[PDB]
Short mmCIF file of C-alpha atoms and ligand atoms in Angstrom, two decimals:
data_model
loop_
_atom_site.label_atom_id
_atom_site.label_comp_id
_atom_site.label_asym_id
_atom_site.label_seq_id
_atom_site.Cartn_x
_atom_site.Cartn_y
_atom_site.Cartn_z
CA UNK A 1 100.27 120.64 119.01
CA UNK A 2 97.83 121.56 116.23
CA UNK A 3 99.29 121.81 112.72
CA UNK A 4 98.82 125.41 111.50
CA UNK A 5 100.22 126.95 114.68
CA UNK A 6 103.00 124.42 115.08
CA UNK A 7 103.77 125.52 111.50
CA UNK A 8 104.07 129.23 112.31
CA UNK A 9 106.10 128.35 115.42
CA UNK A 10 108.68 126.48 113.32
CA UNK A 11 108.80 129.28 110.74
CA UNK A 12 109.33 132.00 113.35
CA UNK A 13 111.97 129.90 115.12
CA UNK A 14 113.61 128.73 111.87
CA UNK A 15 113.97 125.14 113.10
CA UNK A 16 112.81 123.08 110.08
CA UNK A 17 116.21 121.40 109.72
CA UNK A 18 116.16 120.30 113.36
CA UNK A 19 112.61 118.93 113.14
CA UNK A 20 113.52 117.01 109.98
CA UNK A 21 116.71 115.59 111.49
CA UNK A 22 114.69 114.28 114.45
CA UNK A 23 112.48 112.37 112.00
CA UNK A 24 115.57 110.91 110.32
CA UNK A 25 116.93 109.79 113.71
CA UNK A 26 113.69 108.09 114.83
CA UNK A 27 112.90 106.39 111.49
CA UNK A 28 112.74 102.60 111.27
CA UNK A 29 115.66 100.50 110.02
CA UNK A 30 114.70 97.11 108.56
CA UNK A 31 116.75 94.75 106.34
CA UNK A 32 116.83 95.12 102.53
CA UNK A 33 118.87 91.99 101.72
CA UNK A 34 117.15 91.06 98.44
CA UNK A 35 117.77 94.55 96.97
CA UNK A 36 121.51 94.22 97.63
CA UNK A 37 122.08 90.82 95.96
CA UNK A 38 124.60 91.16 93.10
CA UNK A 39 122.11 89.91 90.48
CA UNK A 40 119.88 92.94 91.21
CA UNK A 41 122.43 95.74 90.75
CA UNK A 42 121.02 96.88 87.40
CA UNK A 43 117.47 96.87 88.87
CA UNK A 44 118.25 99.75 91.28
CA UNK A 45 118.63 103.38 90.20
CA UNK A 46 120.35 104.56 93.40
CA UNK A 47 122.53 102.44 95.67
CA UNK A 48 121.20 104.12 98.84
CA UNK A 49 117.44 103.74 98.07
CA UNK A 50 116.18 100.16 98.53
CA UNK A 51 112.85 98.51 99.50
CA UNK A 52 112.70 96.73 102.86
CA UNK A 53 112.33 92.95 102.57
CA UNK A 54 109.16 92.83 104.70
CA UNK A 55 107.16 95.25 102.49
CA UNK A 56 108.68 94.81 99.00
CA UNK A 57 106.44 93.99 96.01
CA UNK A 58 107.23 90.56 94.55
CA UNK A 59 106.92 89.88 90.82
CA UNK A 60 105.07 86.63 90.01
CA UNK A 61 108.13 85.06 88.43
CA UNK A 62 110.29 82.17 89.61
CA UNK A 63 113.57 83.33 88.03
CA UNK A 64 113.88 86.75 89.70
CA UNK A 65 111.01 88.31 91.63
CA UNK A 66 112.77 91.61 92.46
CA UNK A 67 111.58 95.17 91.73
CA UNK A 68 112.48 98.38 93.63
CA UNK A 69 108.91 98.97 94.95
CA UNK A 70 107.23 98.97 98.39
CA UNK A 71 103.64 98.50 99.71
CA UNK A 72 102.67 101.34 102.11
CA UNK A 73 99.53 100.04 103.98
CA UNK A 74 97.82 102.71 106.15
CA UNK A 75 95.52 100.86 108.54
CA UNK A 76 93.47 103.66 110.16
CA UNK A 77 93.08 105.63 106.92
CA UNK A 78 92.20 102.46 104.93
CA UNK A 79 94.44 103.44 102.00
CA UNK A 80 97.30 101.55 100.36
CA UNK A 81 99.98 102.85 97.94
CA UNK A 82 102.82 101.25 95.99
CA UNK A 83 105.86 103.59 95.92
CA UNK A 84 108.53 102.81 93.30
CA UNK A 85 111.52 104.35 91.49
CA UNK A 86 111.25 105.71 87.98
CA UNK A 87 111.66 102.72 85.65
CA UNK A 88 115.13 101.97 84.18
CA UNK A 89 115.82 100.80 80.60
CA UNK A 90 116.05 97.20 81.88
CA UNK A 91 113.01 97.40 84.21
CA UNK A 92 110.19 98.87 82.07
CA UNK A 93 108.75 95.37 81.48
CA UNK A 94 108.94 94.58 85.21
CA UNK A 95 107.11 97.87 85.98
CA UNK A 96 104.10 97.00 83.80
CA UNK A 97 104.13 93.39 85.07
CA UNK A 98 103.69 94.83 88.60
CA UNK A 99 100.83 97.11 87.50
CA UNK A 100 99.09 94.08 85.95
CA UNK A 101 99.69 91.63 88.83
CA UNK A 102 98.68 94.10 91.59
CA UNK A 103 95.43 95.11 89.74
CA UNK A 104 96.25 98.84 89.88
CA UNK A 105 93.98 101.30 88.07
CA UNK A 106 96.26 104.36 88.14
CA UNK A 107 99.93 105.38 87.83
CA UNK A 108 101.00 108.73 89.36
CA UNK A 109 104.22 110.27 87.89
CA UNK A 110 105.72 113.33 89.64
CA UNK A 111 108.88 113.93 87.54
CA UNK A 112 109.81 114.76 83.95
CA UNK A 113 111.79 112.22 81.89
CA UNK A 114 114.66 114.76 81.71
CA UNK A 115 115.43 117.19 84.57
CA UNK A 116 118.62 119.19 85.23
CA UNK A 117 119.90 117.99 81.83
CA UNK A 118 119.98 114.27 82.87
CA UNK A 119 117.60 111.33 82.47
CA UNK A 120 115.44 110.73 85.57
CA UNK A 121 113.49 107.75 84.17
CA UNK A 122 112.92 105.80 80.97
CA UNK A 123 110.29 106.77 78.39
CA UNK A 124 108.08 103.90 79.52
CA UNK A 125 104.73 104.71 77.83
CA UNK A 126 103.85 105.38 74.16
CA UNK A 127 103.61 108.94 72.86
CA UNK A 128 101.50 108.25 69.72
CA UNK A 129 98.30 106.20 69.33
CA UNK A 130 99.60 104.34 66.26
CA UNK A 131 103.02 103.43 67.83
CA UNK A 132 102.27 100.91 70.59
CA UNK A 133 104.90 99.31 72.86
CA UNK A 134 105.57 95.59 73.32
CA UNK A 135 107.53 94.34 76.36
CA UNK A 136 108.82 90.97 75.24
CA UNK A 137 110.42 89.91 78.53
CA UNK A 138 107.03 90.08 80.36
CA UNK A 139 104.65 89.54 77.38
CA UNK A 140 102.61 92.76 77.66
CA UNK A 141 101.35 95.29 75.11
CA UNK A 142 100.71 98.95 75.94
CA UNK A 143 98.71 101.38 73.73
CA UNK A 144 98.02 105.12 74.09
CA UNK A 145 94.21 105.66 73.87
CA UNK A 146 93.89 109.42 74.61
CA UNK A 147 95.82 112.31 76.15
CA UNK A 148 94.56 115.51 77.85
CA UNK A 149 97.28 118.18 78.37
CA UNK A 150 96.58 120.85 80.98
CA UNK A 151 98.71 123.68 82.34
CA UNK A 152 100.12 121.81 85.37
CA UNK A 153 99.50 118.14 84.56
CA UNK A 154 98.58 115.68 81.80
CA UNK A 155 96.15 112.70 82.03
CA UNK A 156 96.48 109.75 79.65
CA UNK A 157 94.26 106.75 79.05
CA UNK A 158 96.30 103.58 78.34
CA UNK A 159 95.32 100.01 77.36
CA UNK A 160 97.42 97.25 78.91
CA UNK A 161 97.05 93.78 77.32
CA UNK A 162 98.35 90.54 78.79
CA UNK A 163 99.43 88.82 75.56
CA UNK A 164 99.40 85.38 77.23
CA UNK A 165 95.64 85.51 78.04
CA UNK A 166 94.45 88.31 75.68
CA UNK A 167 92.86 90.06 78.67
CA UNK A 168 92.86 93.88 78.53
CA UNK A 169 92.57 96.66 81.14
CA UNK A 170 92.29 100.43 81.14
CA UNK A 171 95.07 102.24 83.09
CA UNK A 172 94.98 105.97 83.94
CA UNK A 173 98.33 107.88 83.84
CA UNK A 174 98.39 111.04 85.98
CA UNK A 175 101.51 113.10 85.17
CA UNK A 176 102.33 116.17 87.28
CA UNK A 177 104.59 118.09 84.90
CA UNK A 178 105.48 121.32 86.72
CA UNK A 179 107.47 120.43 89.88
CA UNK A 180 110.55 122.69 89.68
CA UNK A 181 114.01 121.30 88.89
CA UNK A 182 115.23 122.73 92.25
CA UNK A 183 113.31 123.18 95.51
CA UNK A 184 109.53 122.83 95.98
CA UNK A 185 106.53 124.74 94.54
CA UNK A 186 105.83 128.16 96.03
CA UNK A 187 102.11 127.39 96.48
CA UNK A 188 100.51 123.94 97.06
CA UNK A 189 97.42 124.86 95.03
CA UNK A 190 98.28 123.05 91.79
CA UNK A 191 99.58 119.95 93.65
CA UNK A 192 96.32 119.74 95.65
CA UNK A 193 94.22 120.21 92.51
CA UNK A 194 96.21 117.32 91.00
CA UNK A 195 95.64 115.10 94.09
CA UNK A 196 91.90 115.75 93.85
CA UNK A 197 91.89 114.76 90.16
CA UNK A 198 93.56 111.44 91.03
CA UNK A 199 90.97 110.88 93.81
CA UNK A 200 88.03 111.69 91.53
CA UNK A 201 89.15 109.03 88.99
CA UNK A 202 88.68 106.05 91.39
CA UNK A 203 92.38 105.18 91.27
CA UNK A 204 92.80 105.44 95.07
CA UNK A 205 89.66 103.53 96.00
CA UNK A 206 89.33 100.04 97.56
CA UNK A 207 87.66 98.47 94.50
CA UNK A 208 91.08 98.58 92.77
CA UNK A 209 94.61 97.44 93.61
CA UNK A 210 96.92 100.08 95.11
CA UNK A 211 97.85 103.11 93.02
CA UNK A 212 101.48 103.05 91.75
CA UNK A 213 103.30 106.34 92.61
CA UNK A 214 106.81 107.31 91.42
CA UNK A 215 109.31 110.11 90.91
CA UNK A 216 113.03 109.46 90.24
CA UNK A 217 113.91 107.61 93.51
CA UNK A 218 110.33 107.06 94.70
CA UNK A 219 110.80 108.65 98.16
CA UNK A 220 110.76 112.48 97.96
CA UNK A 221 107.96 113.93 95.81
CA UNK A 222 106.28 110.48 96.03
CA UNK A 223 106.36 110.66 99.83
CA UNK A 224 104.80 114.14 99.76
CA UNK A 225 101.86 112.86 97.66
CA UNK A 226 100.89 109.92 99.93
CA UNK A 227 101.58 111.83 103.17
CA UNK A 228 99.25 114.67 102.12
CA UNK A 229 96.53 112.29 100.91
CA UNK A 230 96.55 110.17 104.11
CA UNK A 231 96.59 113.19 106.48
CA UNK A 232 93.60 114.80 104.73
CA UNK A 233 91.63 111.51 104.83
CA UNK A 234 92.29 111.16 108.59
CA UNK A 235 91.07 114.74 109.19
CA UNK A 236 87.74 113.76 107.55
CA UNK A 237 87.37 110.45 109.46
CA UNK A 238 88.18 111.55 113.06
CA UNK A 239 85.98 113.39 115.56
CA UNK A 240 88.86 115.78 116.31
CA UNK A 241 90.75 116.77 113.12
CA UNK A 242 93.33 118.75 115.11
CA UNK A 243 94.55 115.42 116.54
CA UNK A 244 96.19 114.48 113.21
CA UNK A 245 99.98 114.59 113.74
CA UNK A 246 101.80 114.81 110.41
CA UNK A 247 105.17 113.80 111.93
CA UNK A 248 103.61 110.64 113.43
CA UNK A 249 101.95 109.74 110.11
CA UNK A 250 105.29 110.19 108.30
CA UNK A 251 107.08 107.93 110.78
CA UNK A 252 104.34 105.28 110.29
CA UNK A 253 104.86 105.44 106.51
CA UNK A 254 108.65 105.11 106.99
CA UNK A 255 108.04 101.67 108.54
CA UNK A 256 107.25 100.56 104.94
CA UNK A 257 109.83 102.46 102.78
CA UNK A 258 113.03 104.29 103.76
CA UNK A 259 113.70 107.98 103.23
CA UNK A 260 110.20 109.35 102.58
CA UNK A 261 110.48 113.17 102.41
CA UNK A 262 114.08 113.94 101.35
CA UNK A 263 114.59 117.52 102.59
CA UNK A 264 113.35 119.96 105.23
CA UNK A 265 111.81 122.00 102.37
CA UNK A 266 109.74 118.97 101.32
CA UNK A 267 108.63 118.59 104.96
CA UNK A 268 107.52 122.23 105.15
CA UNK A 269 105.75 121.89 101.79
CA UNK A 270 103.84 118.84 103.07
CA UNK A 271 102.59 120.83 106.09
CA UNK A 272 101.52 123.67 103.79
CA UNK A 273 99.62 121.31 101.50
CA UNK A 274 97.70 119.64 104.34
CA UNK A 275 96.86 123.00 105.96
CA UNK A 276 95.47 124.54 102.77
CA UNK A 277 93.78 121.35 101.73
CA UNK A 278 91.85 121.08 104.99
CA UNK A 279 90.14 124.43 104.29
CA UNK A 280 88.98 123.47 100.83
CA UNK A 281 87.53 120.15 101.94
CA UNK A 282 84.90 121.99 103.97
C1 LIG B 301 86.45 101.84 78.84
N1 LIG B 301 87.63 101.09 78.53
C2 LIG B 301 87.65 99.76 78.36
C3 LIG B 301 88.96 99.38 78.05
C4 LIG B 301 89.73 100.60 78.04
C5 LIG B 301 91.07 100.83 77.79
C6 LIG B 301 91.51 102.12 77.85
C7 LIG B 301 90.65 103.15 78.13
C8 LIG B 301 89.33 102.95 78.37
C9 LIG B 301 88.88 101.63 78.32
C10 LIG B 301 89.27 97.95 77.83
C11 LIG B 301 88.10 96.89 77.73
C12 LIG B 301 86.75 97.53 77.59
C13 LIG B 301 86.61 98.78 78.47
C14 LIG B 301 86.64 98.32 79.91
O1 LIG B 301 86.87 99.42 80.83
C15 LIG B 301 87.75 97.21 80.05
N2 LIG B 301 88.10 96.21 78.99
#
């Protein structure tokens, strides 16, 4: 079926939970043996969210190459994304090592450091120009260059230096700051405006490594971001945009990381975002 009328048909019939459970039943199951090794317990935020072995990002280190991060490679859309958990106190150096090694231009953050009165990720970037951060375990330096605070999101320019080679690179930090502590946003308008700002920066384009996208677990809000982006790109590429099937795209993405889209409300919100976004594109 088309999307907008399939949408109204699920609303009128109140069957979002049944649609979402079907997706959960059909989703791929691949091994995640490296994630579950005892030496990696303090590298995982949640025991039930792990990268598959076949698609995990490897650190360029011979001691321990493990990080909770996955490469989502979308062949028809010609887009790739790295989805990862919010960094932990003992993985902030690994996080920036990955950004460096994978040649990423942008980092997309969809959570606040504290939500619901608890810490959802480490404070992993500097808050003042004159107070830079050094990650001694991976030999990197990170400096805040500029910050632009808007009503729904903040954009930061960061300088990442590999202290071993003295090479430097400019990284863009796109921080969506207004996702509610509970539920999903009422309107997709600010989320879509944010997606378009990331696109306009070059961070999603083939002349760079894959964008790094995270929330707390790296599957719910993060899944919504890449699902909406890929569906909108396919609607622009194909002769028949009504052939784009958001459930089929989500199942393709779940071949590369488990659990993408965590609730039926996130699934409905993803439909809403793609529907409204397709009208603005034209
Ligand atoms: C424009 N720019 C540059 C850097 C940078 C770091 C943060 C923000 C912007 C930046 C680092 C140096 C020179 C240039 C270049 O793009 C890369 N090498």
